[PDB]
Amino acid sequence: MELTPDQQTLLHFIMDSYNKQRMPQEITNKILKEAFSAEENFLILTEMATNHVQVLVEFTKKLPGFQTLDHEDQIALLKGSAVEAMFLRSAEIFNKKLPSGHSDLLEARIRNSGISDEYITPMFSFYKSIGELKMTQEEYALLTAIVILSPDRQYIKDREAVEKLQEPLLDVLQKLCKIHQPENPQHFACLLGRLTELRTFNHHHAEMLMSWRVNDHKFTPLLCEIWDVQ
């Protein structure tokens, strides 16, 4: 089937909250403009991530029914999805079309940003896997909402209440996948399968950050709450 009137409303509404994020070029312009030291990149990363968590909270609050969830559950979902949302947004930005030779330079600059070699590999492997899916803006917006309303999260007391909120977004995403790519009845499951690779960034995020090739690792207090560093 096609999107119902209620599903088009939900999609446009998720699209509008999603678009409140910092524009991709505002990020890639800076990285492409000039090379920075690992210390300068660490501060660009922390300020980008503080802004991102801030916007992600506002995005999450707008998710239909999120406000009706238990307060402890609301916190558990935010804390359980922030790192994954950041890397999915980083993958969205990375795979955006740029002039000839720019993506190569952007990739070289990230590679030499100060991040440990141990982490460059699974990071770029994930970004390229996302790239092969040729996701639309709507697919990234719905995937981000689905990542956030994950009932299979740690410390969630009422899973069914979270399941009820995720299921309608999973349905809109499925219908969208079927339309945009009739050529791949696997599209929906590939998109859902990438979400499993995304979770792996949770376990090693703290070590990825602490191994940044800088002398001091300062984070903002909002990032200490979310990332559990410092």
Added chain:
Amino acid sequence: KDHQLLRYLLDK
């Protein structure tokens, strides 16, 4: 108290 900045942003 553990996630006070996060609880503050969720309420506001």
